[PDB]
Amino acid sequence: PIDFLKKEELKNIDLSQMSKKERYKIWKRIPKCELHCHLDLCFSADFFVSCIRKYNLQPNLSDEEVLDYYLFAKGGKSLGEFVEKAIKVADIFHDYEVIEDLAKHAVFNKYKEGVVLMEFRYSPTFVAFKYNLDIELIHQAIVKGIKEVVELLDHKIHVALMCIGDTGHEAANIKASADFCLKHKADFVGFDHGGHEVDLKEYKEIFDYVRESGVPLSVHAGEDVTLPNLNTLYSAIQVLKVERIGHGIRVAESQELIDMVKEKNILLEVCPISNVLLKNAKSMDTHPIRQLYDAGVKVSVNSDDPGMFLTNINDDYEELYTHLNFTLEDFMKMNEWALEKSFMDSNIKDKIKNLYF
Numbered sequence: 450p451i452d453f454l455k456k457e458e459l460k461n462i463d464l465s466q467m468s469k470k471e472r473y474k475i476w477k478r479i480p481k482c483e484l485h486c487h488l489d490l491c492f493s494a495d496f497f498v499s500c501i502r503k504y505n506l507q508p509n510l511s512d513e514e515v516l517d518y519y520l521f522a523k524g525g526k527s528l529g530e531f532v533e534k535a536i537k538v539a540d541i542f543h544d545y546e547v548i549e550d551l552a553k554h555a556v557f558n559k560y561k562e563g564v565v566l567m568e569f570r571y572s573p574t575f576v577a578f579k580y581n582l583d584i585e586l587i588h589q590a591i592v593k594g595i596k597e598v599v600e601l602l603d604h605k606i607h608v609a610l611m612c613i614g615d616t617g618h619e620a621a622n623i624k625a626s627a628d629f630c631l632k633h634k635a636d637f638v639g640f641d642h643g644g645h646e647v648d649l650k651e652y653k654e655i656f657d658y659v660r661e662s663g664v665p666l667s668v669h670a671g672e673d674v675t676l677p678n679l680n681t682l683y684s685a686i687q688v689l690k691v692e693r694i695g696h697g698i699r700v701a702e703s704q705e706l707i708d709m710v711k712e713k714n715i716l717l718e719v720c721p722i723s724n725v726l727l728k729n730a731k732s733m734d735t736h737p738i739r740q741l742y743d744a745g746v747k748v749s750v751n752s753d754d755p756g757m758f759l760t761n762i763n764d765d766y767e768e769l770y771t772h773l774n775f776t777l778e779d780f781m782k783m784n785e786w787a788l789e790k791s792f793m794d795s796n797i798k799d800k801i802k803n804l805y806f
């Protein structure tokens with residue numbers, strides 16, 4: 450099915466001749482390596498509404514109202530308002546069946562979008578808390594859902610998992626999450642922190658234990674523009690010794706951090722639309738990915754939470770092309786960096802490079 454663009458062919462495409470719908474056929478055929486996407490918040494509008502109606506969760510609400518009430522598609526005030534609506538959305542984590550269904554839906558849609566390498570991340574405590582589910586059984590449902598789809602797809606998309614410890618919901622427990630990550634070392638390729646952006650320095654020992662056991666780190670940092678300084682970024686880099694940074698857009702505010710990230714070969718996982726919708730960037734026109742890219746910082750393109758925003762990865766490419774003048778060449782380059790920085794087994798990484806790059 451998917452006829453992926455090859456580096457050789459990029460000179461033959463003239464995007465300026467195409468309508469938006471048309472450019473979408475081009476974005477889909479970019480062989481995409483996506484590093485930053487929350488599985489637990491990865492769904493289409495049709496899937497989300499089906500889940501609400503399945504459990505008769507909002508019988509007083511029309512479809513439009515459900516989406517408005519639960520999601521962030523029209524954006525909101527801050528990372529802070531985001532966390533509060535994420536909590537409502539956990540209304541869908543009703544049982545292990547819907548969770549396995551979600552994993553299947555999410556993998557299948559990434560495949561249809563032209564994603565070839567997909568690292569999903571999820572927070573066990575976030576999925577479990579609402580209906581007090583068992584995290585072992587949650588993780589089994591997700592694993593089984595993923596394996597079913599990839600095998601059905603004759604492994605045309607390669608998928609791995611990262612574990613998230615988080616801050617912001619009632620059952621949040623970073624240590625529990627790290628222990629769980631290590632117990633399932635076999636399934637998890639990385640460990641992350643999300644939710645409220647805190648300075649993770651105070652969890653140094655937990656992150657050192659994870660990292661030293663052989664599980665690399667990529668934490669959310671340098672996202673929230675309401676924080677008074679860049680302490681969280683310094684801690685991620687110097688204390689947690691991360692290999693990648695979720696967002697990292699505030700690196701753009703500091704010449705010293707730009708130098709440090711280049712010097713340390715750290716990649717920033719940029720989620721452009723997420724940044725605009727949470728007001729961490731004024732507009733796509735002024736998004737720091739442009740400045741970061743031009744300064745020599747390694748960056749990749751990510752969707753973050755397709756369910757909360759009601760977008761998919763190809764929306765992010767469209768925005769980058771349209772508002773910030775990125776080229777097909779840039780996109781192939783960012784995707785190869787992302788493959789290079791991926792936490793997946795290197796044999797798998799070799800195949801993908803052979804196949805697409």
Ligand SMILES: CSC[C@H]1O[C@@H](n2cnc3c2N=CNC[C@H]3O)[C@H](O)[C@@H]1O
Binds near residue numbers: 621669672723
């Ligand atoms: C404490 S609830 C917020 C939850 O939603 C997750 N999250 C989803 N999208 C993002 C999240 N966390 C932090 N920054 C905003 C965005 O990247 C986070 O991992 C956490 O699991």
Ligand SMILES: [Zn+2]
Binds near residue numbers: 485643669753
């Ligand atoms: Zn994220």
